[PDB]
Each structure stands twice: as C-alpha cells, then as structure tokens.
Design an enzyme around this catalytic site. Structure first.
Site, mmCIF file in Angstrom:
data_model
loop_
_atom_site.group_PDB
_atom_site.id
_atom_site.type_symbol
_atom_site.label_atom_id
_atom_site.label_comp_id
_atom_site.label_asym_id
_atom_site.label_seq_id
_atom_site.Cartn_x
_atom_site.Cartn_y
_atom_site.Cartn_z
ATOM 1 N N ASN B 95 0.796 -1.212 0.000
ATOM 2 C CA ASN B 95 0.000 0.000 0.000
ATOM 3 C C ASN B 95 0.842 1.282 0.000
ATOM 4 O O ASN B 95 0.416 2.316 -0.520
ATOM 5 C CB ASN B 95 -0.924 -0.066 1.212
ATOM 6 C CG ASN B 95 -1.784 1.148 1.355
ATOM 7 O OD1 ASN B 95 -2.759 1.332 0.612
ATOM 8 N ND2 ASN B 95 -1.448 1.986 2.334
ATOM 9 N N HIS B 96 2.064 1.223 0.513
ATOM 10 C CA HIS B 96 2.860 2.436 0.648
ATOM 11 C C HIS B 96 3.160 3.016 -0.721
ATOM 12 O O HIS B 96 3.151 2.299 -1.724
ATOM 13 C CB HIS B 96 4.165 2.123 1.384
ATOM 14 C CG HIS B 96 5.038 1.129 0.672
ATOM 15 N ND1 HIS B 96 4.833 -0.233 0.751
ATOM 16 C CD2 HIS B 96 6.127 1.298 -0.115
ATOM 17 C CE1 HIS B 96 5.758 -0.859 0.042
ATOM 18 N NE2 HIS B 96 6.553 0.048 -0.498
ATOM 19 N N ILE B 97 3.364 4.338 -0.768
ATOM 20 C CA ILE B 97 3.937 5.016 -1.929
ATOM 21 C C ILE B 97 4.802 6.164 -1.437
ATOM 22 O O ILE B 97 4.620 6.679 -0.330
ATOM 23 C CB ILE B 97 2.904 5.564 -2.949
ATOM 24 C CG1 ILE B 97 2.153 6.760 -2.406
ATOM 25 C CG2 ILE B 97 1.921 4.511 -3.413
ATOM 26 C CD1 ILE B 97 1.447 7.492 -3.498
ATOM 27 N N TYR B 159 4.649 9.244 -11.030
ATOM 28 C CA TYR B 159 3.780 8.349 -10.265
ATOM 29 C C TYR B 159 3.015 7.413 -11.189
ATOM 30 O O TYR B 159 3.016 6.193 -11.000
ATOM 31 C CB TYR B 159 2.793 9.195 -9.464
ATOM 32 C CG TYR B 159 1.611 8.498 -8.823
ATOM 33 C CD1 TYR B 159 1.736 7.838 -7.618
ATOM 34 C CD2 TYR B 159 0.357 8.524 -9.437
ATOM 35 C CE1 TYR B 159 0.638 7.239 -7.022
ATOM 36 C CE2 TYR B 159 -0.740 7.915 -8.864
ATOM 37 C CZ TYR B 159 -0.599 7.274 -7.652
ATOM 38 O OH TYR B 159 -1.694 6.659 -7.077
ATOM 39 N N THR B 196 -8.219 10.877 1.616
ATOM 40 C CA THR B 196 -7.232 10.888 2.672
ATOM 41 C C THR B 196 -6.681 12.297 2.858
ATOM 42 O O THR B 196 -6.842 13.173 2.005
ATOM 43 C CB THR B 196 -6.088 9.938 2.373
ATOM 44 O OG1 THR B 196 -5.318 9.794 3.568
ATOM 45 C CG2 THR B 196 -5.208 10.541 1.307
HETATM 46 N N1 LIG Z 1 -5.204 8.705 -1.779
HETATM 47 C C1 LIG Z 1 -5.870 8.460 -3.056
HETATM 48 O O1 LIG Z 1 -6.680 9.150 -3.465
HETATM 49 C C2 LIG Z 1 -5.430 7.246 -3.929
HETATM 50 C C3 LIG Z 1 -5.931 7.051 -5.184
HETATM 51 C C4 LIG Z 1 -5.530 5.991 -5.920
HETATM 52 C C5 LIG Z 1 -4.591 5.100 -5.387
HETATM 53 N N2 LIG Z 1 -4.102 5.309 -4.143
HETATM 54 C C6 LIG Z 1 -3.100 4.402 -3.532
HETATM 55 O O2 LIG Z 1 -3.626 4.165 -2.100
HETATM 56 C C7 LIG Z 1 -2.322 3.948 -1.275
HETATM 57 C C8 LIG Z 1 -2.307 4.891 0.026
HETATM 58 O O3 LIG Z 1 -3.071 6.088 -0.358
HETATM 59 P P1 LIG Z 1 -3.062 7.338 0.752
HETATM 60 O O4 LIG Z 1 -3.865 8.468 0.312
HETATM 61 O O5 LIG Z 1 -3.619 6.771 2.036
HETATM 62 O O6 LIG Z 1 -1.522 7.740 1.142
HETATM 63 P P2 LIG Z 1 -1.058 8.404 2.587
HETATM 64 O O7 LIG Z 1 -2.283 8.853 3.402
HETATM 65 O O8 LIG Z 1 -0.120 9.595 2.494
HETATM 66 O O9 LIG Z 1 -0.326 7.188 3.353
HETATM 67 C C9 LIG Z 1 0.995 7.054 3.034
HETATM 68 C C10 LIG Z 1 1.636 5.919 3.738
HETATM 69 O O10 LIG Z 1 2.685 5.546 3.043
HETATM 70 C C11 LIG Z 1 3.894 5.613 3.920
HETATM 71 N N3 LIG Z 1 5.017 6.076 3.324
HETATM 72 C C12 LIG Z 1 5.382 7.194 2.686
HETATM 73 N N4 LIG Z 1 6.681 7.112 2.316
HETATM 74 C C13 LIG Z 1 7.122 5.913 2.747
HETATM 75 C C14 LIG Z 1 8.346 5.334 2.630
HETATM 76 N N5 LIG Z 1 9.566 5.789 2.035
HETATM 77 N N6 LIG Z 1 8.575 4.133 3.125
HETATM 78 C C15 LIG Z 1 7.573 3.485 3.741
HETATM 79 N N7 LIG Z 1 6.358 4.052 3.857
HETATM 80 C C16 LIG Z 1 6.129 5.268 3.362
HETATM 81 C C17 LIG Z 1 3.382 6.673 5.065
HETATM 82 O O11 LIG Z 1 3.993 6.293 6.361
HETATM 83 P P3 LIG Z 1 5.235 7.229 6.853
HETATM 84 O O12 LIG Z 1 4.854 8.717 6.594
HETATM 85 O O13 LIG Z 1 5.372 6.983 8.298
HETATM 86 O O14 LIG Z 1 6.522 6.884 6.116
HETATM 87 C C18 LIG Z 1 2.158 6.584 5.167
HETATM 88 O O15 LIG Z 1 1.816 5.752 6.317
HETATM 89 C C19 LIG Z 1 -1.363 4.291 -2.014
HETATM 90 O O16 LIG Z 1 -0.585 3.084 -2.425
HETATM 91 C C20 LIG Z 1 -1.987 4.981 -3.404
HETATM 92 O O17 LIG Z 1 -1.083 4.740 -4.557
HETATM 93 C C21 LIG Z 1 -4.515 6.356 -3.406
HETATM 94 C C1 LIG Z 2 -2.360 12.460 -4.772
HETATM 95 C C2 LIG Z 2 -1.671 11.102 -4.747
HETATM 96 C C3 LIG Z 2 -2.632 9.942 -4.656
HETATM 97 C C4 LIG Z 2 -3.335 9.654 -5.934
HETATM 98 N N1 LIG Z 2 -3.251 8.556 -6.657
HETATM 99 N N2 LIG Z 2 -4.067 8.728 -7.784
HETATM 100 C C5 LIG Z 2 -4.651 9.921 -7.679
HETATM 101 C C6 LIG Z 2 -5.590 10.506 -8.677
HETATM 102 C C7 LIG Z 2 -4.977 11.770 -9.297
HETATM 103 C C8 LIG Z 2 -5.940 12.364 -10.326
HETATM 104 C C9 LIG Z 2 -7.267 12.716 -9.658
HETATM 105 C C10 LIG Z 2 -7.891 11.454 -9.071
HETATM 106 C C11 LIG Z 2 -8.129 10.440 -10.186
HETATM 107 C C12 LIG Z 2 -6.801 10.089 -10.851
HETATM 108 C C13 LIG Z 2 -6.184 11.350 -11.444
HETATM 109 C C14 LIG Z 2 -5.847 9.500 -9.811
HETATM 110 C C15 LIG Z 2 -6.942 10.859 -8.029
HETATM 111 N N3 LIG Z 2 -4.180 10.531 -6.529
HETATM 112 C C16 LIG Z 2 -4.511 11.852 -5.999
HETATM 113 C C17 LIG Z 2 -3.278 12.733 -5.959
#
Ligand SMILES: NC(=O)c1ccc[n+]([C@@H]2O[C@H](COP(=O)([O-])OP(=O)(O)OC[C@H]3O[C@@H](n4cnc5c(N)ncnc54)[C@H](OP(=O)(O)O)[C@@H]3O)[C@@H](O)[C@H]2O)c1
Ligand SMILES: C1CCc2nnc([C@]34C[C@H]5C[C@H](C[C@H](C5)C3)C4)n2CC1
Ligand SMILES: NC(=O)c1ccc[n+]([C@@H]2O[C@H](COP(=O)([O-])OP(=O)(O)OC[C@H]3O[C@@H](n4cnc5c(N)ncnc54)[C@H](OP(=O)(O)O)[C@@H]3O)[C@@H](O)[C@H]2O)c1
Ligand SMILES: C1CCc2nnc([C@]34C[C@H]5C[C@H](C[C@H](C5)C3)C4)n2CC1
Lengths: 239, 240
Positions: B95-97, B159, B196
């Site tokens: 899950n991390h990024i 990304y 988030t």
């Molecule tokens: N948020 C969205 O809208 C969205 C959309 C599509 C896909 N996703 C995917 O959903 C996943 C999490 O989304 P999110 O919004 O919840 O992100 P987030 O709230 O910022 O959570 C990030 C997590 O990743 C960890 N992280 C960051 N850098 C790291 C590193 N070098 N090593 C290990 N851990 C690290 C953070 O822990 P620390 O800060 O303690 O390192 C943190 O706990 C992601 O894989 C993302 O690609 C998200």
């Molecule tokens: C912060 C990092 C997390 C992340 N991963 N994908 C996205 C999207 C970016 C944009 C707008 C929406 C749909 C699609 C295109 C994917 C969300 N985000 C939001 C930006």
C-alpha cells in the site's frame, strides 16, 4: 495526411539500440531517405559497420557513439554529442532494450531492476536531454514498445513491467505537453512479434504468433513518427 | 457469493504504508475482523498509536516494524521479521507510496527513480520475500494501485509510470502463477480519488473529482483480497 519518404529527407535523427534488429533497420531506412543519423549501442564494432553502410545507402551524416544505456550519465552525455555532431535534433527514436528471455519469474530482482533502468529510466533521461533541442524544431519523440506493454503475458513479467511504465510515463507527458506549449510529439509503437534475430531465438519453440518483417516494421515506426501519429501498431493483422 | 467479516478472522496479514490514510484504515478494519496484523511505515511514533488502537479493536496479534521501503534490504528483512511475529503470512497488502504531488514533469529524474523504487521495486522485493510463506498458506497479495495506473493523466507522470509497472508485472506473475502450481492470488486495486489527508491537500483546488471515503475504500480492498478477486475498482460511480 499521407506519408512521403521525403518527409525524412535531410532531418537530424537519433536511433538508439541501432546496432542490430529493428534499430538497425530504421537506421538504414533513415539513410535511404537521406537523413542525418547518429546511432548508438554498446557494440562499437557493429555500430561502425552500420554507420558505413548508412553512408552507402545515402545518409546525409551517419555518425556513431558507443556506450551502455545502463549508465544514466552516458545517456545524458550522448544526446549532447549527437546534437553537436548534427547541429540539432529533429527526431529521437528510443528503441534499445536490455537483453531479456522467456522465463517464469522467481526472484530475479536484478533483472527487474536492470530492465527498468535500461528499458524505462534511460528513455526519460534521454528525453530530458533531448527536449530543448527537440522544442527548437517542433520535433518528435518515438517510443518503441511491445504488445506486452499493453497486455501482460506470462514469462516476461519484468520486461512487461518496463514497457508498461513507458506507457504511463510518455502518455502523461504527452498530455502535459498539450496544456504546456511543447510542440514535441510522442509516438508510442506497440509492436507484435518481429522477426529479428534475438527475438526469434528467444521464442524459438515457445509460442508462434507469425513474426512480421523487421524491414517493414522498422519503416512503419519511422512512418508514424513522421506523421506525428500518437501511437502505431505493427501487424495488428496478426492479432 | 459474499464477503463475511470472519474470512479475515485469525488471518496473519501485513499492511505497508499503514501509518495513515487508507493504509491505516485497512489495519483497523483487520483488527475489527480479529486478524493478526503487522503494520510497517517510517513513523515510529505514529505506528505505535496504530498498533495500540488495533489491540483495542480486537486484533489477535497487532504488532509493528518501522522503516523506509527505500532501503530494499529493509523490505527483504521486514517480511522475515513479520513472519516470525505471526508465524506465517496469509495476505500481503502492498500500500505504501513515496510522497507525490500534482506537478508538471520537467527534469526531475530524481522523482522518477525514487517513484519506481518505492512505488514499484519494493513491491517486487516484498513479494519475493513473502512467496514461500504465502505459498505455504495459499495466501493473497494485494497491490493498491490508482486510476492513474490504468489511464495517463497530466501532472502525475512519474507516479503514473510506477503504477503502470505494477499492473504489467503483477498481471504477468498472476498468469505465470496460473500455469505453475502457485495458489497465491494477486488482487490489483484501481482506486479513484480517496479522501485521505494528503491526497485532498495535494489535489486541493486543482482537480475536482468526487472524493470517495477512505473507510469504505480500505474495506473494499480487503473484501477484494479475501475473495481472491483479480482486481477491484473503488467507486467507479464517480468517473465516466
Ligand atoms: N489517496 C488516493 O486518493 C489514492 C488514489 C488511488 C490510489 N491510491 C493508492 O492508495 C495507497 C495509500 O493512499 P493514501 O492516500 O492513504 O496515502 P497516505 O495517506 O499519504 O499514506 C501514506 C503511507 O505511506 C507511507 N510512506 C510514505 N513514504 C514511505 C516510505 N519511504 N517508506 C515506507 N512508507 C512510506 C506513510 O507512512 P510514513 O509517513 O510513516 O513513512 C504513510 O503511512 C497508495 O498506495 C496509493 O497509490 C490512493
Ligand atoms: C495524490 C496522490 C494519490 C493519488 N493517486 N491517484 C490519484 C488521482 C490523481 C488524479 C485525480 C484522481 C483520479 C486520478 C487522477 C488519480 C486521483 N491521486 C490523488 C493525488
Ligand atoms: N523483436 C520483437 O519481436 C519486438 C516485439 C515487441 C517490441 N519490440 C521492441 O523493439 C525494440 C528492439 O527489438 P529488437 O529485435 O531490435 O531487439 P535487439 O535485436 O536485441 O536489439 C537490441 C538493441 O538494444 C541494444 N542494447 C541492448 N542492451 C543495451 C545496453 N545496455 N545499452 C545500450 N544498448 C543496448 C543492442 O545493442 P548492443 O548489443 O550493442 O548493446 C541492440 O542494438 C525493442 O525496444 C523491443 O522492446 C520488439
Ligand atoms: C524477444 C524480447 C522482445 C519482445 N518484445 N515483445 C515480445 C513479444 C513477447 C510475446 C510474444 C510476442 C508478442 C508479445 C508477447 C510481445 C513477442 N518480445 C519477444 C522477443
């Protein structure tokens, strides 16, 4: 707009992975069209033979530089030299890939990483180097990808990972270029099996899709980039 | 057929990037289903608070290990330590990024590389570490990807490239596993915008999509992994 072999006439073109396979065919095709070419690869030896036959075929310029696309510093520096040699750049044909073979994936991270470095990362590095020169010419970027970069296939996972990344990266940059002012086009080539030496050896008794000719393929890439086509698919007739 | 909160009951699960966001939401869901959870991230302090609330929520085990998925060695050793703690592995939730934000790409090769390393390489490295334990349990792998891992979007090029690689790689490994004798499933999650903290701040006033809830998201991922779904799409109701 139709393709005309004259569209390439005189243009300054760079072809990576040009010492053999499809890469070489494009260089000869570009020479027959009277273009300026700078070919790169590792085989200093083979490149020289390709440069020379390029002149005989009619290239306007025909130089070469040898070095590994494993070293990002080379990729960067190479574009400088190639631009100096030609006094500019019109088209950047990104075609080289690190050697891969059909194998179930077990734990070969080394291949996964090297594949990502040579097949994806270096393309960005070369693109970053070439962008200014390409902007001054409203030029073109050509990314040679595989059908495995659109569809995941077994036994090529790491390579497949790299050819997807190109898709994600260059397909977005193209969008940014749109709302920016960047007049550099990006043609992504999705090729099926092409009857190159290295490929045919690698697939020898595994699965037959009727490879298509490397000569015709090499041109069809050049054709697409000339027409600033967004992407090109060679012998979809075989899919 | 349907998901039952018990399917995760007692299961030994790993959740990366669990220090916050959707990653944290998944850890809490897992505790409420009474599973063993081992969360990892960089934030030592924040992780401790997550393990504690997981015990409270009813998790069977609920531990933590801290470290960055930038250090490939850590990822390798992390699954080792994590397996000892739970005595096996049932599900590996990647899950991390690395932190990313909306930015046109100019010449930040540094971000392209760090993005491939953390968003993609570490997943393979972690996947390699867990395969024995996962084979021994007929377990599941969950790769959390984006709608950008399927469609190219401006301002997220580095990304986006990393998330495409995840699809190509795991989508083949899935097919490889099909003709091998490997009973480990691979669930690819294509999430839209999820509300988030960091995502909403990073997209504020620029992008206007219908954010979707992180609680429902984090569960909808787990439901997908429980049922051995090839991929899961979260609130496609928000895009078309
Ligand atoms: N948020 C969205 O809208 C969205 C959309 C599509 C896909 N996703 C995917 O959903 C996943 C999490 O989304 P999110 O919004 O919840 O992100 P987030 O709230 O910022 O959570 C990030 C997590 O990743 C960890 N992280 C960051 N850098 C790291 C590193 N070098 N090593 C290990 N851990 C690290 C953070 O822990 P620390 O800060 O303690 O390192 C943190 O706990 C992601 O894989 C993302 O690609 C998200
Ligand atoms: C912060 C990092 C997390 C992340 N991963 N994908 C996205 C999207 C970016 C944009 C707008 C929406 C749909 C699609 C295109 C994917 C969300 N985000 C939001 C930006
Ligand atoms: N052939 C097919 O069926 C097929 C199908 C789909 C897609 N494609 C794509 O078509 C492109 C070429 O196909 P191909 O048949 O021409 O492969 P190829 O015949 O083996 O050509 C490989 C080229 O890449 C260069 N290369 C390999 N490692 C390198 C390195 N570290 N540094 C710099 N150059 C390196 C080689 O030069 P040196 O050996 O001298 O280093 C060589 O000229 C590739 O981008 C491939 O992804 C091909
Ligand atoms: C050597 C590596 C270079 C390469 N690039 N694409 C391929 C393909 C692999 C398989 C079979 C066929 C169609 C498609 C799936 C793409 C050819 N190869 C194989 C040859």
């Amino acid at each position: 707009e139709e393709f005309r072999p004259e569209m390439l006439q005189g243009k300054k073109v760079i072809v990576t992975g040009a010492s053999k396979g499809i890469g070489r065919e494009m260089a000869y095709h570009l020479a027959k069209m009277g273009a300026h070419v700078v070919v790169t690869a590792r085989s200093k030896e083979t490149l020289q033979k390709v440069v020379s036959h390029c002149l005989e075929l009619g290239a306007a310029s025909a130089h070469y530089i040898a070095g590994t696309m494993e070293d990002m510093t080379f990729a960067e520096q190479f574009v400088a030299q190639a631009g100096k040699l030609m006094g500019g750049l019109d088209m950047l044909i990104l075609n080289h890939i690190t050697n891969t073979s059909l194998n179930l994936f077990h734990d070969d991270i080394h291949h996964v990483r090297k594949s990502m470095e040579v097949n994806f990362l270096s393309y960005v590095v070369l693109t970053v180097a070439a962008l200014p020169m390409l902007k001054q010419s409203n030029g073109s970027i050509v990314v040679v990808s595989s059908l495995a970069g659109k569809v995941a296939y077994p036994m090529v996972a790491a390579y497949s990972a790299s050819k997807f990344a190109l898709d994600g990266f260059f397909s977005s940059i193209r969008k940014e270029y749109s709302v920016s002012r960047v007049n550099v086009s990006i043609t992504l080539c999705v090729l099926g099996l092409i009857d190159t030496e290295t490929a045919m050896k690698a697939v020898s008794g595994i699965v037959h899709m009727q490879a298509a000719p490397k000569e015709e393929c090499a041109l069809e890439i050049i054709k697409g980039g000339a027409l600033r086509q967004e992407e090109v698919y060679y012998d979809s007739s075989l899919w």
